[PDB]
Amino acid sequence: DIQMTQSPSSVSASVGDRVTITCRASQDISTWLAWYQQKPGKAPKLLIYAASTLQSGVPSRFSGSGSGTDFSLTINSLQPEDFATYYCQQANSFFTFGGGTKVEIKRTVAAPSVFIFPPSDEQLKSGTASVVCLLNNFYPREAKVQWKVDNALQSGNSQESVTEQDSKDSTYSLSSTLTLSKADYEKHKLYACEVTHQGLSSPVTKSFN
Amino acid sequence: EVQLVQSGAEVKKPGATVKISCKASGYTFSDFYMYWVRQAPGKGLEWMGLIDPEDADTMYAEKFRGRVTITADTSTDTGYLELSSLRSEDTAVYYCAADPWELNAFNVWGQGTLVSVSSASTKGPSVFPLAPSSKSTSGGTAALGCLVKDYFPEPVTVSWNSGALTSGVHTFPAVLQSSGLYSLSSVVTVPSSSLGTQTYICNVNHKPSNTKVDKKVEPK
Amino acid sequence: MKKVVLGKKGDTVELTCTASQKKSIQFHWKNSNQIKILGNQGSFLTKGPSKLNDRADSRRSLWDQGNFPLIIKNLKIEDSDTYICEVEDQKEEVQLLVFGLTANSDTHLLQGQSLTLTLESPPGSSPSVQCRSPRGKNIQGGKTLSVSQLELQDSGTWTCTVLQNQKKVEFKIDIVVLAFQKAS
Amino acid sequence: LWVTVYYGVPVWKEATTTLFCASDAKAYDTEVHNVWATHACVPTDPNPQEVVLVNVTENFNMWKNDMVEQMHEDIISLWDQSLKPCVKLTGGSVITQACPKVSFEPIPIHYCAPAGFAILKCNNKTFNGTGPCTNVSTVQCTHGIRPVVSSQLLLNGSLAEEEVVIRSVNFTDNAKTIIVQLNTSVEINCTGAGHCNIARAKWNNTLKQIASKLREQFGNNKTIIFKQSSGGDPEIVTHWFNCGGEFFYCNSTQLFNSTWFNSTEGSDTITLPCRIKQIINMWQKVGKAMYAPPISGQIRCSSNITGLLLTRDGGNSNNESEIFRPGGGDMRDNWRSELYKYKVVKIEPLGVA
Ligand SMILES: *[C@@H]1O[C@H](CO[C@H]2O[C@@H](C)[C@@H](O)[C@@H](O)[C@@H]2O)[C@@H](O)[C@H](O)[C@H]1NC(C)=O
Ligand SMILES: *[C@@H]1O[C@H](CO)[C@@H](O)[C@H](O)[C@H]1NC(C)=O
Ligand SMILES: *[C@@H]1O[C@H](CO)[C@@H](O)[C@H](O)[C@H]1NC(C)=O
Ligand SMILES: *[C@@H]1O[C@H](CO)[C@@H](O)[C@H](O)[C@H]1NC(C)=O
Ligand SMILES: *[C@@H]1O[C@H](CO)[C@@H](O)[C@H](O)[C@H]1NC(C)=O
Ligand SMILES: *[C@@H]1O[C@H](CO)[C@@H](O)[C@H](O)[C@H]1NC(C)=O
Ligand SMILES: *[C@@H]1O[C@H](CO)[C@@H](O)[C@H](O)[C@H]1NC(C)=O
Ligand SMILES: *[C@@H]1O[C@H](CO)[C@@H](O)[C@H](O)[C@H]1NC(C)=O
Ligand SMILES: *[C@@H]1O[C@H](CO)[C@@H](O)[C@H](O)[C@H]1NC(C)=O
Ligand SMILES: *[C@@H]1O[C@H](CO)[C@@H](O)[C@H](O)[C@H]1NC(C)=O
Ligand SMILES: *[C@H]1O[C@H](CO)[C@@H](O)[C@H](O)[C@H]1NC(C)=O
């Protein structure tokens, strides 16, 4: 098939700011392109068709240009309801979508409120223990979490997940789960998770016994 | 006026074959192409194919050829979609779209159809508390919450105090484990002073297994 | 003699046709009444006014190798006929015979369960039906094969093999036994 | 009268060679036919003449004319560099490429014999195309042949000079096409709005003429009935044809629903339901191709119906009547409806008497 390659993958901008995201087809497709907006938890919304033609009922500050292979969607005065993920799409025959471009906000570096939760009662009576690590309200979305049991860093048995950007303070939150067993948890007594975030002067470790 | 009403979520085991629908209304069905798109959990959109109902002319993306089939019952204004030899990476939401105005783009969309493909079958969540460490002698705000482990498939909605406490609530997205069971976790920050008096109850709801579970938390 | 092909009612059959050289050339399938069934016009397919119209349909991908099959789906008994493939001054002929077989089972109180297998054979043919009990109890039969009262052992998979023109077609029937007689 | 005269009589023989072509193409027109013809043809006549050969009889065979095979390859080679599809599906293989909309109107082409060869031409007006012609003549080049690709109806072609003519490689074999030639063109006016007009009264008589020619060929005692395509591909079942880059599929049932010689307002203009298609079957070889969406809303194309491609049903049952349905598909029949009176021949040493 023909490849649609849009960049950047992510871009942060403030309100009133002007943003430009570009698309690029591996083969000439004329002016047959389309741009979509998609906010988390809902279906995509048509923005632009025919590469330049504005969809009805869409703010004039939206506009795309280009023809053939190189295209670009551009938002003038960026708005609060303009922060989402945008996609381009070939529209002449096949309808391949571009990788995607997320336009997130922009705010100030915030340190993560680090927490640590040991396996509770009921979870031990089933023979499977899992330790939770919680980074609360921080920015940006980038954070490096390592699990060290008795000063022994392991990898492969942990799973993390990040929330969407808060609608009020526009910050993220991340939780990492260290899954083990019933015996490998009691054979040890000192657990911790080193958290490296750019809003922290030095790495912050949170442990328990 | 115009609309595309898909079918309901469906659970399948690897190797199976799912077939969802998309009843259409508000325009002449057989005069327009219909397109199918899927979107993995938290991943970009991905086109799958199209079809002209009149002559049943079909097109597929490379990643699906000889494994997917799109049809369209013209008499009932309904379109279907089949996916043979299902895998583990086929777990995604499936949209159907159309373009009754011929702008050569997807103007109308369906509400979506969640298809979950795994080894396990519908199983309710085992909820385990997550109580505060140091209480009313420490700080000013302490974290708290529930843990919904081992369940399948999605979704699962969580509230607090029957919809009363929606402040500081952070219901993380679920994650798939090496076992094939999702496992999210809800939390909420509150004053470490109101811990001894206030009782916090989280309300879970696993619609798949028809499960309804409440839980209390305590730093006693 | 002529090339004979036996088929099962409801099944799909592919009748073959091959040219002397590997390239797409004007072919055309007709029956014994010289009624246009299906052929090509270059790289386009065409269907005749026959009764197999909606159910007959070759596929083009193979025409470039000189393969011009006539595929008939959801076979019927009326589809029994000699089909001639005309390609490059040659008229290869084929005899198609479609058998069918139905199963009625009526169980009565103070009687037991009866079974009657009926063979729907094409006009002018001498079939020989041989039904096999799950436990190996073969039974002969002509048009219909009956069993007055089934037994508990007869529950399972019966294979009935039809014999025509030296070769055979095999039917499978899962028999469920509702009632069997027993000395009290 | 005592003055013995020695004649140098000509001698030729059936042969095959690569012909060239001539056109009134323009080097300033950016439409595909003109563009192709320019780089691939020669300027024109402009006063063509033939050498009538008195009391000479020659045998023809339109159904085995290697002039057709060559023209076919040229029209194919034309579409390859002209109508670029967006997708090309052929032999388990898929291709994607740019597909620019381009002006597309067929231009008459003359096929000419090279140095050493000649082209015999039948001057007999009512000639079926297979058998002896007792009125031949020699030409440098054929006449103007528009490469009109289509089914059911033959467009912008050549009319019979006398009465309506029908031609078939084998009238008995029902699988064989019946190329028809009209002595009076019928206009079919098309539009992008999705319909096609055809004068009802004129087309009515047009069928009575054809019917009478068919009733003559299959005993003057059989009832002639026309019916809709018996099924097949969209390009066969409907009057498929190109018109301004867009492929049209028109329902032709109202055309072919008549019964003649039987016994046994009033539309003023037959209106045919039509529709462009982006996804079409290929005529070149086996496969499909998808094209871009229509551009301008003004897609008016007026053409002359000069011929028909029919097929007969027959069978060991149809007695006292015959049934004819639109057909076509093999573009060679389209060529043979024009190259039926021609025949390329090799020239060699003269033979004294
Ligand atoms: C066919 O046309 C006959 C009229 O002759 C046509 O020839 C043209 C070349 C022109 O010179 C005019 O003479 C006419 O348009 C018509 O009278 C016959 O009825 C038709 N013959 C049949 C019935 O096939
Ligand atoms: C036929 O041809 C010869 C010349 O080849 C000519 O002399 C003769 O007069 C012609 N016959 C007729 C019809 O007079
Ligand atoms: C041969 O055809 C010409 C027209 O091309 C005609 O004038 C001539 O009379 C014909 N010859 C005869 C006598 O058949
Ligand atoms: C025309 O075709 C017939 C066969 O259809 C043939 O017998 C005859 O010789 C040809 N010549 C005529 C009559 O023009
Ligand atoms: C054209 O047609 C007849 C058909 O018999 C053919 O024999 C001859 O070449 C021509 N007849 C004429 C010129 O009268
Ligand atoms: C002409 O068609 C008939 C009917 O199909 C066929 O029997 C006959 O062989 C054909 N004639 C030739 C020239 O082969
Ligand atoms: C138009 O053509 C279709 C077949 O393509 C036919 O079924 C239908 O009856 C036709 N409609 C009209 C105008 O009669
Ligand atoms: C042919 O088709 C028309 C509709 O397009 C129908 O009304 C008419 O009855 C048909 N003609 C005949 C002879 O049955
Ligand atoms: C002509 O009309 C009669 C009724 O008058 C009809 O039965 C017949 O089918 C028609 N044509 C034929 C095939 O004789
Ligand atoms: C026939 O010729 C006319 C020239 O005016 C043109 O408009 C039309 O497109 C042609 N038709 C076809 C089918 O090429
Ligand atoms: C036939 O149609 C064309 C336009 O497609 C027109 O230019 C030409 O004059 C017409 N010929 C006749 C005989 O009217």
Tab-separated table of N, CA, C and O in Angstrom, chain D residues 250-289:
chain	number	residue	atom	x	y	z
D	250	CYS	N	-24.691	2.265	-18.189
D	250	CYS	CA	-26.088	2.626	-18.421
D	250	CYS	C	-26.992	1.409	-18.555
D	250	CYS	O	-26.676	0.463	-19.271
D	251	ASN	N	-28.126	1.444	-17.860
D	251	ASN	CA	-29.133	0.400	-17.990
D	251	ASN	C	-29.733	0.478	-19.381
D	251	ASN	O	-30.147	1.553	-19.819
D	252	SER	N	-29.772	-0.651	-20.079
D	252	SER	CA	-30.198	-0.674	-21.474
D	252	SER	C	-31.458	-1.509	-21.686
D	252	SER	O	-31.806	-1.849	-22.814
D	253	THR	N	-32.145	-1.827	-20.594
D	253	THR	CA	-33.317	-2.691	-20.653
D	253	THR	C	-34.455	-2.101	-21.489
D	253	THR	O	-35.156	-2.829	-22.192
D	254	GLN	N	-34.635	-0.787	-21.412
D	254	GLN	CA	-35.697	-0.120	-22.160
D	254	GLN	C	-35.425	-0.164	-23.664
D	254	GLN	O	-36.345	-0.035	-24.480
D	255	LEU	N	-34.158	-0.334	-24.023
D	255	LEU	CA	-33.767	-0.471	-25.420
D	255	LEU	C	-34.169	-1.845	-25.938
D	255	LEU	O	-34.772	-1.979	-27.005
D	256	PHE	N	-33.846	-2.871	-25.161
D	256	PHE	CA	-34.006	-4.245	-25.600
D	256	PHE	C	-35.131	-4.970	-24.882
D	256	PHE	O	-34.905	-5.983	-24.229
D	257	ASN	N	-36.341	-4.441	-25.017
D	257	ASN	CA	-37.537	-5.104	-24.516
D	257	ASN	C	-38.642	-5.014	-25.564
D	257	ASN	O	-39.694	-4.417	-25.327
D	258	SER	N	-38.388	-5.608	-26.724
D	258	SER	CA	-39.302	-5.519	-27.855
D	258	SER	C	-39.645	-6.904	-28.387
D	258	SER	O	-38.881	-7.852	-28.203
D	259	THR	N	-40.793	-7.017	-29.044
D	259	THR	CA	-41.164	-8.255	-29.728
D	259	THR	C	-41.662	-7.968	-31.149
D	259	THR	O	-42.608	-7.202	-31.345
D	260	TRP	N	-41.021	-8.597	-32.131
D	260	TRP	CA	-41.278	-8.289	-33.534
D	260	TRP	C	-41.807	-9.473	-34.333
D	260	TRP	O	-41.510	-10.627	-34.029
D	261	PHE	N	-42.594	-9.176	-35.360
D	261	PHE	CA	-43.164	-10.213	-36.212
D	261	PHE	C	-44.122	-11.106	-35.428
D	261	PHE	O	-44.536	-12.160	-35.908
D	262	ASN	N	-44.471	-10.673	-34.221
D	262	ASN	CA	-45.377	-11.436	-33.367
D	262	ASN	C	-46.833	-11.031	-33.566
D	262	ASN	O	-47.128	-10.066	-34.271
D	263	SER	N	-47.740	-11.775	-32.940
D	263	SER	CA	-49.167	-11.497	-33.047
D	263	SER	C	-49.934	-12.088	-31.870
D	263	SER	O	-49.976	-13.306	-31.692
D	264	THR	N	-50.537	-11.218	-31.067
D	264	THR	CA	-50.469	-9.782	-31.305
D	264	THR	C	-50.293	-9.475	-32.788
D	264	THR	O	-51.009	-10.015	-33.633
D	265	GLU	N	-49.408	8.199	-25.563
D	265	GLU	CA	-48.098	8.477	-24.989
D	265	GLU	C	-47.734	7.455	-23.918
D	265	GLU	O	-48.430	7.323	-22.911
D	266	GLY	N	-46.642	6.733	-24.142
D	266	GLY	CA	-45.841	6.912	-25.338
D	266	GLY	C	-44.689	7.873	-25.127
D	266	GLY	O	-44.744	9.028	-25.553
D	267	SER	N	-43.640	7.396	-24.465
D	267	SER	CA	-42.468	8.217	-24.194
D	267	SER	C	-41.993	8.932	-25.453
D	267	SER	O	-42.090	8.397	-26.559
D	268	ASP	N	-41.475	10.144	-25.282
D	268	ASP	CA	-40.986	10.935	-26.404
D	268	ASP	C	-39.476	10.789	-26.566
D	268	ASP	O	-38.912	11.176	-27.590
D	269	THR	N	-38.828	10.231	-25.548
D	269	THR	CA	-37.383	10.034	-25.574
D	269	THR	C	-36.933	9.088	-24.468
D	269	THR	O	-36.991	9.428	-23.286
D	270	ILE	N	-36.485	7.898	-24.859
D	270	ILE	CA	-36.021	6.905	-23.904
D	270	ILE	C	-34.942	7.488	-23.006
D	270	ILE	O	-33.948	8.033	-23.488
D	271	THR	N	-35.146	7.378	-21.697
D	271	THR	CA	-34.175	7.866	-20.729
D	271	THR	C	-33.550	6.695	-19.976
D	271	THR	O	-34.246	5.939	-19.302
D	272	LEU	N	-32.235	6.558	-20.092
D	272	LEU	CA	-31.534	5.426	-19.499
D	272	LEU	C	-30.832	5.809	-18.203
D	272	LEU	O	-30.051	6.755	-18.172
D	273	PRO	N	-31.113	5.064	-17.127
D	273	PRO	CA	-30.453	5.220	-15.828
D	273	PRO	C	-28.963	4.907	-15.915
D	273	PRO	O	-28.602	3.778	-16.234
D	274	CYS	N	-28.110	5.884	-15.626
D	274	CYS	CA	-26.669	5.678	-15.725
D	274	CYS	C	-25.929	6.009	-14.434
D	274	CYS	O	-26.496	6.605	-13.518
D	275	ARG	N	-24.658	5.622	-14.368
D	275	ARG	CA	-23.834	5.873	-13.194
D	275	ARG	C	-22.358	5.624	-13.477
D	275	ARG	O	-21.978	4.564	-13.984
D	276	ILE	N	-21.525	6.607	-13.156
D	276	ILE	CA	-20.078	6.448	-13.246
D	276	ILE	C	-19.636	5.425	-12.206
D	276	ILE	O	-20.361	5.159	-11.251
D	277	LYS	N	-18.460	4.835	-12.396
D	277	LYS	CA	-17.892	3.950	-11.384
D	277	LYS	C	-16.388	4.153	-11.249
D	277	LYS	O	-15.681	4.291	-12.242
D	278	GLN	N	-15.905	4.175	-10.013
D	278	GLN	CA	-14.481	4.321	-9.753
D	278	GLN	C	-13.787	2.966	-9.859
D	278	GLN	O	-12.611	2.889	-10.208
D	279	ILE	N	-14.526	1.903	-9.565
D	279	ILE	CA	-13.972	0.557	-9.597
D	279	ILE	C	-14.474	-0.201	-10.818
D	279	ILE	O	-15.658	-0.532	-10.905
D	280	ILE	N	-13.582	-0.482	-11.759
D	280	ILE	CA	-13.977	-1.140	-13.000
D	280	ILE	C	-13.118	-2.356	-13.337
D	280	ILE	O	-11.953	-2.445	-12.938
D	281	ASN	N	-13.712	-3.292	-14.073
D	281	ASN	CA	-12.973	-4.423	-14.621
D	281	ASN	C	-12.154	-3.970	-15.825
D	281	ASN	O	-12.541	-3.045	-16.533
D	282	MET	N	-11.021	-4.627	-16.051
D	282	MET	CA	-10.142	-4.273	-17.157
D	282	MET	C	-10.541	-4.992	-18.440
D	282	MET	O	-11.008	-6.126	-18.400
D	283	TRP	N	-10.360	-4.321	-19.574
D	283	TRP	CA	-10.586	-4.936	-20.879
D	283	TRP	C	-9.261	-5.382	-21.493
D	283	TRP	O	-9.220	-6.335	-22.272
D	284	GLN	N	-8.180	-4.687	-21.139
D	284	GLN	CA	-6.839	-5.066	-21.579
D	284	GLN	C	-6.574	-6.531	-21.266
D	284	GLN	O	-6.486	-7.368	-22.166
D	285	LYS	N	-6.443	-6.831	-19.975
D	285	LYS	CA	-6.318	-8.204	-19.503
D	285	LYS	C	-7.273	-8.428	-18.343
D	285	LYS	O	-8.173	-7.626	-18.101
D	286	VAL	N	-7.073	-9.527	-17.624
D	286	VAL	CA	-7.916	-9.850	-16.481
D	286	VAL	C	-7.454	-9.091	-15.240
D	286	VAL	O	-6.267	-9.094	-14.907
D	287	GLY	N	-8.398	-8.445	-14.560
D	287	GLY	CA	-8.086	-7.661	-13.379
D	287	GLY	C	-9.030	-6.492	-13.183
D	287	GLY	O	-9.908	-6.247	-14.012
D	288	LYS	N	-8.855	-5.767	-12.082
D	288	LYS	CA	-9.685	-4.605	-11.782
D	288	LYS	C	-8.819	-3.371	-11.647
D	288	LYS	O	-7.598	-3.470	-11.526
D	289	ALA	N	-9.451	-2.208	-11.653
D	289	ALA	CA	-8.732	-0.958	-11.462
D	289	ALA	C	-9.649	0.082	-10.852
D	289	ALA	O	-10.831	0.167	-11.198
